[PDB]
């Protein structure tokens, strides 16, 4: 086509979606990771994670307001990945990289799994 | 912080949100622009438009599944702006620029209003 494109649009959209999350505006699901609860927007979760895409495209699960993750999932790892979904920034540290990588494999977030593998290989 | 950032994340999120819209997945509102209907995600509309942000933060309107726009709004202008929200690309043409600019002023999409004003000034 003959379209023009606003370079910062996608980043500005994501920043506003994170502001809605901060302010608990139109959040429509609670993700439970053992004793912790995280509120989010189903559409953002599906856009970022192959696991959430499969969950919320299922005719029965699409209607649930609470999703319980596998008890082996670390809440801090999940929190770091949820922040990444809404900001593009990943708080990867020596003390959390194994939990983050395990959580990203479970959530099916291939680009995160890729950077974790590279950072782990560099330390070996 | 000491975060790393994935450059393409925001664009990839927006591309997936547009794929959900295409496939009518988790759309939660119908916008009516005279005889036409457009399905969308409230969160994307709020993230892009000052008018939708005000509508869906209102305690009564946040619960509506149908929103009727002012009868003066052109459906093609709205369609072009809805595509811009989900893609960052604006199909601006000599034959649609006045309707697009009028619609962006109504929806409170300041960056679009800005490029329309510049393209109009260049033709004068």
């Amino acid at each position: 086509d003959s379209c023009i494109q606003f370079t910062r649009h996608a980043s500005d959209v994501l920043l506003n979606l994170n502001r809605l999350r901060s302010r608990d505006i139109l959040t429509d699901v609670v993700i439970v990771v053992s004793r912790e609860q995280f509120r989010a927007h189903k559409t953002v979760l599906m856009a970022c994670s192959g696991l959430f895409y499969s969950i919320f495209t299922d005719q029965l699960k699409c209607n649930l307001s609470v999703i319980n993750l596998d008890p082996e999932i670390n809440p801090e790892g999940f929190c770091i990945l949820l922040d990444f979904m809404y900001t593009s920034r990943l708080n990867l540290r020596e003390g959390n990289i194994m939990a983050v990588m395990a959580t990203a494999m479970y959530l099916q977030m291939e680009h995160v799994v890729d950077t974790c593998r590279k950072f782990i290989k560099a330390s070996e | 912080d000491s975060c790393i950032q994935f450059t393409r994340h925001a664009s990839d999120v927006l591309l997936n949100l547009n794929r959900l819209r295409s496939r009518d997945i988790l759309t939660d509102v119908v916008i009516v622009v005279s005889r036409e209907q457009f399905r969308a995600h409230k969160t994307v509309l709020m993230a892009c438009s000052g008018l939708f942000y005000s509508i869906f933060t209102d305690q009564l309107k946040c619960n509506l599944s149908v929103i009727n726009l002012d009868p003066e709004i052109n459906p093609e202008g709205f369609c072009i702006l809805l595509d811009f929200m989900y893609t960052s690309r604006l199909n601006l043409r000599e034959g649609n620029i006045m309707a697009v600019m009028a619609t962006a002023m109504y929806l409170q999409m300041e960056h679009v209003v800005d490029t329309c004003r510049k393209f109009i000034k260049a033709s004068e």
Partner: peptide, 4 residues
């Protein structure tokens, strides 16, 4: 704004 750019030409994509």
């Amino acid at each position: 704004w750019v030409i994509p």
